[PDB]
Point group: C6
Chain length 191, copies 6
């Protein structure tokens, strides 16, 4: 799906999984975000968007086009309170996909705090996040490189059904989550 | 006549029930306003409904730039009744499509369901009380989310007898069923 | 010019007579509303303006008047809290009068909740309102159609002194309350 | 004396007197009101300003002043909370004076609530206001006509050196308060 | 493009020595204020600005400086809550200094509330303020004319060491505080 | 590298090493501050921002940047509350870096309240801030000149390892923090 990403982050009912949605429609450069989102999660969307815009050239988003779009990120179920920083890289991925028409890869989830520099910072509650992904039949989860330590204390039955890809930067997350290569143009070389 | 109207079933502090969702779309400059003693969740459902229409504007027969040329006012009477939740979403989407196209809505049809940006219809809570309101209100046909079908067993036989309940998965089905012309 | 209508609506000390004032001078589209107005009454003014906007051409108003008018709705006494939806039809009438220069009738008061579609919904406290009109020497009162039931309990002399007209729709209100044609 | 008017209105310390000040310099139509003003007094300013706009042509003011002048109302002492509607006719007078160069008259004070139609409505605590006028060497006081009967329960000596003019309409206030025929 | 004055005004610590800063960088008329300022102090900034604007021609400031400058008034220490009207004459001084390039004499501190007419009104806590100027090594202090009596209850040993200039109007403050005659 | 500064400031636990980020992409002047920042810290960003504007020309910065760029200051970790004025010089450094493309030295940490005139004011918690820098591998720390006295009671081993540069003004800060001469 274009603009749809599965994040793992905190909701009232524990650190469940989140179905993030995004729309990029004819407009005037307005950003709106909804889904009973707490302050910290809101700010993660703002950080995620700035990350995209700072990388517009590499990702092929023209500023002309971007200022003629409104963006709405919505996170159903609408009434469920969600919060925290851990959907950061999912917001970013969703927004790149939304702006470029680049479909998100099926059966991937991701968790991690985004920074303006593109670094994926570690999150809390990896146990229950991975539990939620397993429960949902997710096949591949992207997690912060720096949470690799936390995999040890997770039951090996859940670990077995999940393909875990620890990531350090947003460029890697995008290559792992989107169908087409989001950064640059493709050069073929032969030896 | 730039005002769409649709019978919704949604939560109210006087026991969540039958409401008319209204949506006007007069000449303007792309301002959204919403009224009716709405809680935050319901307010956000209006945003989501709008976005569904804006994204599907061509497939729906609406000018894709309609939003620069129109003001949108969504109102949910009765005006003093505190109301909330996502269950009016598909009614808001329908009202807005009606308002912009001139296609009237069937007054004998009511609807309940959370809408997503992807045009899917998600399940709601308190289906009993919703369907009770549709029954008491003399509504003929109710659209409910497909995932609320299992909830239909707890509904009293006489309400199931009275009401033609059509479960829906997508906004497409909603519009086909609720709008008079297409 | 200055639009001026007598409504019956809730104040801190109960339902009472309110002088609703409107000014609509050349401008850029600003809406201001004052009078120690609670949020519900504020929303009723928004609803009333939308009704007018949606009927602009039928009413003979340039449909882009909102681009070139500022509108100030004010409800004295300034210090007295007021609230609820029952001035809706008065607000609409005041707006129409001001924007068309069609003066409001002498000795008419009105109570009733407006909706964007133009249906007039019933209000509470009709007895207190009708008593206030009667004490104030008002000759004609427009009430919502679904308040006909509340007339039984009104003192007989009050019913006899007042000309009471139940209305279903805003068009009826404008025809009865405005001095000229519409 | 231009744009400077003595109002009589409520302050947190009493019904004290108010030195209302105004500035109106070329700009984009900014409106600023300061002086620890409560919501009701702020609302009286908006009412006063709409009355001026509605009458701009008859008062010698260019009606585009809303877009060509920045207006600042300020009521020292800055930290003293002030509120209520009773400075309404003082605000209207201040604004007219500021916008036409017409100085207010020495030793005049005024109290009265303003309506959009220009009627002056009665106020409370008249005795305290007249006392503040007396202690302030005010020789002429404008008051609402409906406060005439309140002059009875005020004593002989706190009035005998005050020239009290009960007024019904804003025109009368402006004629009495300003130096040149408005 | 940064003016600097030492004021004496109320802080959460007490009415102390305070560096009031103002920048006036090229721009399009935005006003920015920071320094943990309470609402009364913010309003004193608005009065100060209006005073400078009303007198721009006299002072040698280009008219329409408010079209072409952004103004930022900051009062360190950033975390210390401050409030009241007493920095008013210091804000005026800083703004005139920023706009004209006329440096402020660092041997001068000042306190006083400013009115739109340029009058200086008396302030509170004179004792604390003059003690903090003395402790701070300030030679000269400007105070409201009406605060003269208050000197009599401040230790004579402190007051003997201060060159105190009681002032009625903003012109007197600008002549005393600005290095070059404005 | 560019638009990235290591600060020492206040934090809900008490550690104090802060990773300050900035971006300044093409836009229309929007300003966004995130990272759970308290109001005093946000004001320090506004102060820092005006410092850059005042000096834009000297720093090679296009003075149009304030309406031509969108500036985002973010301080992870996103969830951790942060406040106080002690990141002011860091915020200024981060902003200058971003707008010039001049990389910040990764071996430098800093702490210091900033003023509109560019002076660096003393902060609190020096002992805890320096211990954070000692533990965290930083080689050079910029501290306000007036905190020199606080080094006396900090343990020798935490300071023996650090190159501590006490600074009075932002110009020093920028020379020592940035890779290429500002």
């Amino acid at each position: 799906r274009v603009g749809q990403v599965t994040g793992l982050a905190w909701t009232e009912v524990g650190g469940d999984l989140l179905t993030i949605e995004t729309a990029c429609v004819p407009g005037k450069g307005k950003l709106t975000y909804t889904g009973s989102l707490g302050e910290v999660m809101q700010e993660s969307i703002q950080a995620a968007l700035t990350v995209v815009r700072a990388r517009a050239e590499k990702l092929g988003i023209n500023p002309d086009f971007y200022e003629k779009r409104d963006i709405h990120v919505h996170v159903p179920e609408g009434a469920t309170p969600k919060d925290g920083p851990a959907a950061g890289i999912a917001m970013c991925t969703a927004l790149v996909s939304c702006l470029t028409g680049n479909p998100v890869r099926a059966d991937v989830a991701m968790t991690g705090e985004i920074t303006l520099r593109g670094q994926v910072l570690p999150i809390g509650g990896l146990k229950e996040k991975l539990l939620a992904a397993h429960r949902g039949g997710i096949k591949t989860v992207l997690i912060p490189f720096e949470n690799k330590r936390d995999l040890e204390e997770i039951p090996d039955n859940v670990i077995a059904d999940l393909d875990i890809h620890p990531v350090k930067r947003i460029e890697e997350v995008l290559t792992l989550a989107l169908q087409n290569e989001p950064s640059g143009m493709q050069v073929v070389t032969a030896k």
